[PDB]
Amino acid sequence: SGFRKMAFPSGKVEGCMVQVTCGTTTLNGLWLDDVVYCPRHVICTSEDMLNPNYEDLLIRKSNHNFLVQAGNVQLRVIGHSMQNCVLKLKVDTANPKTPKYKFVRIQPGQTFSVLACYNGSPSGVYQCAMRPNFTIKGSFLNGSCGSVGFNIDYDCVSFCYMHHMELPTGVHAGTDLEGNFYGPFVDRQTAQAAGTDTTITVNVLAWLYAAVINGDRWFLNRFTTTLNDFNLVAMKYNYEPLTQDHVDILGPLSAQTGIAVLDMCASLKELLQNGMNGRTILGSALLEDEFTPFDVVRQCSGVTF
């Protein structure tokens, strides 16, 4: 029993974290095979960050201008290239701790583990959702840049996120490992704001299924609804529309608990309209939307990699 916000075990990713320094800028890199991945803005000063020409700044740099440190070991850089907003530094040594991995781009509403790092040293691990507005509600300080996000599937690490910046509202923005931003952000010192966010409906429903599996049942009711009726309520409450694909994904939890997705939507309708009437669900007084259906099945059945 019990339901907790749970990260993937971080050991496979800890063995890949290095320190990258260019001039006075130090941040984290990801050392896989013979390449170190890091944000391209490592080559910038503060002056540069106002209106940077990355092409221009990089051609003026050579391999020896990148200091890469793996624990107390200096790696020899033998090449440097840019892919979108990520810098790739070829080193003369393959990382002997490289796990089986691939690069994946996640969808809004999907979850991942962040390994928060400073100076190439892992500091903490926590679970995040890619928000509908493509930010993450992370916990990051100066030096966290190049910290990475990932999932594990069997023995394969799927890298999905590299940390680039904090927004004025205290939320965070970054790229996939191919250097493509999540959301309408750029790597420059300029005016940028998180768009108005929305609640991830399919995840709230998953979390209500988690609650029922853990004996929290007060919110259940005799009623059912339709996708169209529910989606009018969703729109009003700044909830994402529920699709047939989402209903299908919750199929397992519907079956296991005997509450149909639209049976649970009728619960969620009542909660949005009426509140929790002083009650809690799984120790929260808010409707939690950072657990996916997979997260709930996974945690409630003890999958292990």
Ligand X SMILES: O=C(O)CCc1nccs1
Q: Which spans of this chain sit near its own copies (rule: CB under 8 A)?
A: 1-12, 14-15, 115-119, 121-126, 128, 137-144, 166, 170-172, 214-215, 280, 283-286, 299-305
What secondary structure letter does DSSP report for 13? H
HEC string of 225-283? Answer: CCHHHHHHHHHHCCECCCCHHHHHHCHHHHHHHCCCHHHHHHHHHHHHHHCCCCCCECC
C-beta of 11 vs 275, nearer to Na ion: 275
Q: Pick from 14, 34, 166, 216: which binds ligand X (CB under 6 A)?
A: 166
C-beta of 114 vs 264, nearer to its own copies: 114
24 makes contact with ligand X (CB under 6 A): no
C-beta of 59 vs 286, nearer to its own copies: 286
Q: Indicate if 265 belongs to the active site.
A: no
State how far the Cα of 89 lies from the Cα of 75, in Å rounded to an integer.
Answer: 10
Q: Pick from 106, 156, 227, 282: which binds Cl ion (CB under 5 A)?
A: 106
Q: Which of 16, 117, 145, 265 is catalytic?
A: 145
Q: Pick from 10, 95, 110, 225: which binds Cl ion (CB under 5 A)?
A: 110
Sequential DSSP letters for 41-103: GGG--HHHHTS--HHHHHHT--GGG-EEEETTEEE-EEEEEEETTEEEEEESS--TTPPSEEE
Task: Please report how close the Cβ of residue 217 comes to ligand X at its closest, in angstroms.
Answer: 20
If phi > 0 it is left, if psi is from -120 to 50 it is alpha, else beta; for residue 23 that is left
Site for Na ion in 216-235 (CB under 5 A): 221, 223
Q: Indicate if 64 belongs to the active site.
A: no
- The interface region with Cl ion, picked from 109-117, 145-153, 197-205, 289-297 by CB under 5 A, is 109-117
State how far the Cα of 65 lies from the Cα of 30, in Å rounded to an integer.
Answer: 18
What are residue 169's phi and psi, to 5 degrees? -85, 5
Give contact residues for ligand X (rule: CB under 6 A). 1, 27, 47-51, 140-145, 163, 165-166, 172
Catalytic residues: 41, 145
Give contact residues for Cl ion (rule: CB under 5 A). 106-107, 110
